Amino acid sequence: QNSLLDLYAHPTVVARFSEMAALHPHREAIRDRFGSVDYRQLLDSAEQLSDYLLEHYPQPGVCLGVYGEYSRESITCLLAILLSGHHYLYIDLKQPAAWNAELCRQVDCRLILDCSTTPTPANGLPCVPVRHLPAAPASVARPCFAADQIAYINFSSGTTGRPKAIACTHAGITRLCLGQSFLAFAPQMRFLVNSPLSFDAATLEIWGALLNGGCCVLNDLGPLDPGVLRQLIGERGADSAWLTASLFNTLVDLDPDCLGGLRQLLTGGDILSVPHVRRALLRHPRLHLVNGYGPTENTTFTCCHVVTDDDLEEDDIPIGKAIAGTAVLLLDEHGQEIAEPDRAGEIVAFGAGLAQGYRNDAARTRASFVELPYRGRLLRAYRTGDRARYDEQGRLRFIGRGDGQVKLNGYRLDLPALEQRFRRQPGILDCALLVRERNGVKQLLCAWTGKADASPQALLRQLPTWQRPHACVRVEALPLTLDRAALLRRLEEPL
Numbered sequence: 001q002n003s004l005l006d007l008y009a010h011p012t013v014v015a016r017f018s019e020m021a022a023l024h025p026h027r028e029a030i031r032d033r034f035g036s037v038d039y040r041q042l043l044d045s046a047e048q049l050s051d052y053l054l055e056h057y058p059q060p061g062v063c064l065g066v067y068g069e070y071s072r073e074s075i076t077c078l079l080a081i082l083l084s085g086h087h088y089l090y091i092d093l094k095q096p097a098a099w100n101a102e103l104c105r106q107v108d109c110r111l112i113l114d115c116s117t118t119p120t121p122a123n124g125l126p127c128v129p130v131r132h133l134p135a136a137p138a139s140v141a142r143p144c145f146a147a148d149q150i151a152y153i154n155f156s157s158g159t160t161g162r163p164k165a166i167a168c169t170h171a172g173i174t175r176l177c178l179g180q181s182f183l184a185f186a187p188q189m190r191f192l193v194n195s196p197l198s199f200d201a202a203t204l205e206i207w208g209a210l211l212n213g214g215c216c217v218l219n220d221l222g223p224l225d226p227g228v229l230r231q232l233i234g235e236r237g238a239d240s241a242w243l244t245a246s247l248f249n250t251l252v253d254l255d256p257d258c259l260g261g262l263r264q265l266l267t268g269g270d271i272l273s274v275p276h277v278r279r280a281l282l283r284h285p286r287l288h289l290v291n292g293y294g295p296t297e298n299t300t301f302t303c304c305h306v307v308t309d310d311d312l313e314e315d316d317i318p319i320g321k322a323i324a325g326t327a328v329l330l331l332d333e334h335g336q337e338i339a340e341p342d343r344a345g346e347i348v349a350f351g352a353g354l355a356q357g358y359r360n361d362a363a364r365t366r367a368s369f370v371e372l373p374y375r376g377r378l379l380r381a382y383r384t385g386d387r388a389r390y391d392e393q394g395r396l397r398f399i400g401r402g403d404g405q406v407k408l409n410g411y412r413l414d415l416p417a418l419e420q421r422f423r424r425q426p427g428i429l430d431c432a433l434l435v436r437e438r439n440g441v442k443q444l445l446c447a448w449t450g451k452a453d454a455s456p457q458a459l460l461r462q463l464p465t466w467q468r469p470h471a472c473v474r475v476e477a478l479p480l481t482l483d484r485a486a487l488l489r490r491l492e493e494p495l
């Protein structure tokens with residue numbers, strides 16, 4: 001299938017969830033520090049909240065915000081939003097209010113469901129306390145929709161300087177989570193829920209469990225590290241997890257035994273480090289490790305590869321082949337399909353994972369999502385900007401990008417755009433943005449030339465936390481051979 005590529009070949013999230021809740025009413029849907037919530041309780045709570053949402057927004061298709069740390073409440077919000085025909089958006093209320101207001105305008109986010117326990121100012125944004133909502137009439141009938149309905153929006157900073165809203169579909173989610181061989185190693189499907197909702201890794205962590213009758217094991221313990229992971233596996237029974245590459249590498253460096261008890265571990269988001277994958281698999285030979293690759297426009301994963309014994313001898317771990325519901329081609333400079341190994345091209349994705357588009361940029365949607373030949377037929381397709389090559393087994397081997405896009409703590413970032421943006425502060429002549437790694441975290445560093453009193457504080461105040469350089473340093477001149485090593489080193493220099 002060959003028609004798994006069709007969005008309508010996939011069920012809505014709410015139909016599949018309903019199937020699971022009917023089949024397994026008393027299985028554990030959510031495990032948190034307070035206890036468990038089962039499928040029936042989850043469905044009842046979400047139906048009630050949906051009654052409220054529908055009372056405010058009776059016609060399907062509105063964007064609704066969710067704020068808070070992972071809790072049974074936030075999970076319930078996501079389901080109630082989907083049940084209502086609406087789509088969810090993560091809003092971090094600890095970001096600058098002006099920034100959030102503009103995100104909300106971009107996607108017409110009507111209301112934000114505040115799940116925090118402790119009061120956090122809303123600063124005029126349309127927030128309601130989720131524990132404090134008023135009763136609503138039980139919905140006579142919930143809206144009807146197909147799998148092409150928008151499930152959620154994720155904002156991407158990966159291109160230019162304006163955040164682009166990616167609208168992902170019910171089908172993208174159900175195609176991601178159902179019938180996949182790379183998810184087949186943990187009958188109980190107890191997923192660590194760790195990745196915040198601003199990342200589509202969350203889509204896998206949450207819906208991979210709930211659409212399979214599994215359990216969302218929420219990390220309400222603290223920042224994920226070896227101890228917290230060990231607790232979440234040992235005390236709560238998590239058997240399945242996503243860990244982004246740099247987090248994987250750190251956990252493996254520090255305490256590779258902290259993975260013990262995981263049945264399936266998926267990692268990715270950056271080029272995997274073969275030495276760390278080697279260390280992990282040599283310690284846990286029965287562990288099923290998956291390299292997942294894909295952009296957000298294709299809903300979480302595009303290709304996955306189950307890591308083998310032989311793979312540990314290569315310079316890179318394959319990113320493998322198309323997940324079910326997806327197809328890929330590799331295209332040359334001339335826009336022609338590359339049918340042979342060891343010839344580099346651009347990855348192009350087709351199928352049921354394709355986002356509806358950039359909710360807030362029509363021109364960019366028209367430019368990024370285009371019809372291209374697949375087999376015999378013109379199909380909608382997303383050009384990823386990722387370069388790869390096939391190996392002798394017809395597996396994809398990730399090469400890199402030709403643009404300036406980097407991955408910073410889970411986010412794509414157009415680095416040269418942000419850099420150019422620093423240049424435009426008055427009194428600054430030139431500026432260079434660098435990246436380094438401390439512990440498991442990439443830090444942005446900003447070097448600049450210009451007047452002594454010219455520090456770009458007013459810009460930092462306007463940026464989201466995750467884009468603010470860890471250090472802004474004025475230098476006398478920038479080293480040329482630009483020199484990344486010289487610059488980095490000259491940054492301490494007394495620091």
Ligand SMILES: Nc1ncnc2c1ncn2[C@@H]1O[C@H](COP(=O)(O)O)[C@@H](O)[C@H]1O
Pocket residue numbers: 267268269270271272291292293294295296297319384386398401407410411412
């Ligand atoms: N397994 C992987 N190996 C190498 N690069 C990856 C992998 N997964 C994701 N990426 C990169 O991250 C981009 C998608 O980022 P995101 O949209 O935030 O999920 C891709 O287009 C790649 O550039």
